[PDB]
Swiss-Prot record:
This is Deleted in azoospermia-like. Belongs to the RRM DAZ family. Residues 6-81 form the RRM domain. The lineage of its organism: Eukaryota, Metazoa, Chordata, Craniata, Vertebrata. It comes from the Eukaryota. Changing Y48D: Abolishes RNA-binding but not homodimerization. The gene is Dazl. Expressed predominantly in testis with lower levels in ovary. In testis, it is expressed in pachytene spermatocytes and at lower level in type-B spermatogonia, preleptotene and zygotene spermatocytes. In ovary, it is expressed in maturing follicles. In embryonic and prepuberal ovary, it is expressed in the oocyte and follicular cells. The DAZ domain mediates the interaction with DAZAP1 and DAZAP2. Residues 46-82 are annotated as: Homodimerization. RNA-binding protein, which is essential for gametogenesis in both males and females. Plays a central role during spermatogenesis. Acts by binding to the 3'-UTR of mRNA, specifically recognizing GUU triplets, and thereby regulating the translation of key transcripts. It is found in: Cytoplasm. Homodimer and heterodimer. Forms a heterodimer with DAZ. Interacts with BOLL, DAZAP1 and DAZAP2. Interacts with PUM2. Multiple DAZL RRMs can bind to a single RNA containing multiple GUU triplets.
Length: 82
RNA sequence: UGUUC
């Protein structure tokens, strides 16, 4: 799998945590280019997604963030395309 | 619901 630069995997996304709220958090690190929430074939969120930036970010530092939204702690990692 | 509908 390839590690995608300037992109963060985000799991544990509550179904109420919408794009605006995701950007509200991640904007502290840069200008968000894309938020992609992965859904199943009926459009139901799988509870994870990918946030990418226009600027260079330190992904290893971002993934250290301890943060909770809607009573779920976010599960962060580098983004890998299998 | 853990790595790209």
């Amino acid at each position: 799998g390839k590690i995608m630069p300037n992109t963060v995997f985000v799991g544990g996304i509550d179904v109420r945590m919408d794009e605006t709220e995701i950007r509200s958090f991640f904007a502290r690190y840069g200008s968000v280019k894309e938020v992609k929430i992965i859904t199943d074939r009926t459009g139901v969120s799988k509870g994870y997604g990918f946030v990418s930036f226009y600027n260079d970010v330190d992904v290893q530092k971002i993934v250290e963030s301890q943060i909770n939204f809607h009573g779920k702690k976010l599960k962060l990692g580098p983004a890998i395309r299998k």
